């Protein structure tokens, strides 16, 4: 087991309820993977120097979890299936 | 890789002659201290003194130097070497550099100078020549 920090972007235009749906979904997946919570923060809306698909800005969101080591391998594709999410990255925590 | 401590001590004393430092250190062995005592008898070197530290070592050798500059020894070489055994019958031993030079020949009676070896009529391995 090891620590992990993860960032991901959700769509700026999304309705707050649907945002609650995708966040409870990402949390249910994150706990399905056995990734224990350590801490989290909400960067929220921020302007972008460049668009990814088209959007001029995005909702940043981050999590910090103690976990495998096996889970990220399943978490990535499940982070790929959703059209609502834009980008996701999982960096190891070794400050 | 430390193939032979004695030849190493010989390149130590030769390099020491080249650098003209007053003294240098060598790891201990009775084989080394005996021939060093032989050089002490020959007088080419001023003094040798061991200093104990666990386990082996460390001898400190003081090079002698002439009153009018000049290296005390004009040459030094170890004819004996691993991968090429050498032997010498008691009458067969050369008198290197004629009368000035002396052989260092280990024998059954112990390490001996070519004069003492000729007197004892005892042959043995020729460790090195110094001149």
């Amino acid at each position: 087991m090891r620590k992990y920090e993860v960032m991901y972007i959700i769509r700026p235009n999304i309705d707050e309820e649907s945002k609650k749906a995708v966040i409870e979904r990402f949390n249910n997946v994150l706990t399905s993977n056995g990734a224990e919570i350590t801490g989290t923060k909400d960067w929220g809306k921020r302007r972008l120097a460049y668009e990814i698909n088209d959007f001029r800005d995005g909702f940043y969101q981050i999590v910090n979890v103690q976990s495998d080591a096996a889970a990220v391998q399943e978490f990535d594709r499940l982070a790929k299936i959703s059209d609502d999410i834009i980008r996701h990255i999982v960096v190891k925590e070794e400050e | 890789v430390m193939t032979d401590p004695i030849a190493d001590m010989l390149t130590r004393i030769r390099n020491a002659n080249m650098v003209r430092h007053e003294k240098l250190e060598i790891p201990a062995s009775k084989l080394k201290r005996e021939i060093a005592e032989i050089l002490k008898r020959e007088g080419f070197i001023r003094d040798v003194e061991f200093v104990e530290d666990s386990k082996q070592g460390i001898i400190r050798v003081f090079l002698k130097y002439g009153q009018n500059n000049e290296r005390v020894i004009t040459g030094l070489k170890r004819i004996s070497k691993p991968g090429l055994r050498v032997y010498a019958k008691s009458n067969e031993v050369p008198r290197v550099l004629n009368g000035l030079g002396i052989a260092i020949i280990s024998t059954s009676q112990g390490v001996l100078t070519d004069k003492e070896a000729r007197a004892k009529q005892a042959g043995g391995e020729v460790l090195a020549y110094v001149w």
């Binding site: 972008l48 120097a49 460049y50 990814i52 995005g58 070794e94 400050e95 | -």
Partner: protein, 71 residues
């Protein structure tokens, strides 16, 4: 002989940063040309500059900083 102008100013108030979570200091590292400043100005040791390099690349992955802009 010898001293560099505008050297470091990081180890003096470091260290272990960031690795990339901050945006303000990375905004300090970026040039008007949008590229990382040379060690001749930044003053950092090459290891710190390279860890900083991979860190800012991670920031570009975070899209926290521009990849390219006007000069």
């Amino acid at each position: 002989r010898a001293k560099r102008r505008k050297v470091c100013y990081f180890t003096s108030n470091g260290i272990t940063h960031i690795d990339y979570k901050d945006v303000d200091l990375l905004k300090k590292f970026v040039s008007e040309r949008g590229k990382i400043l040379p060690r001749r100005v930044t003053g950092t040791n090459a290891k710190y500059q390279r860890k900083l390099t991979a860190a800012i690349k991670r920031a570009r992955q975070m899209a926290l900083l521009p990849y390219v802009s006007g000069e």
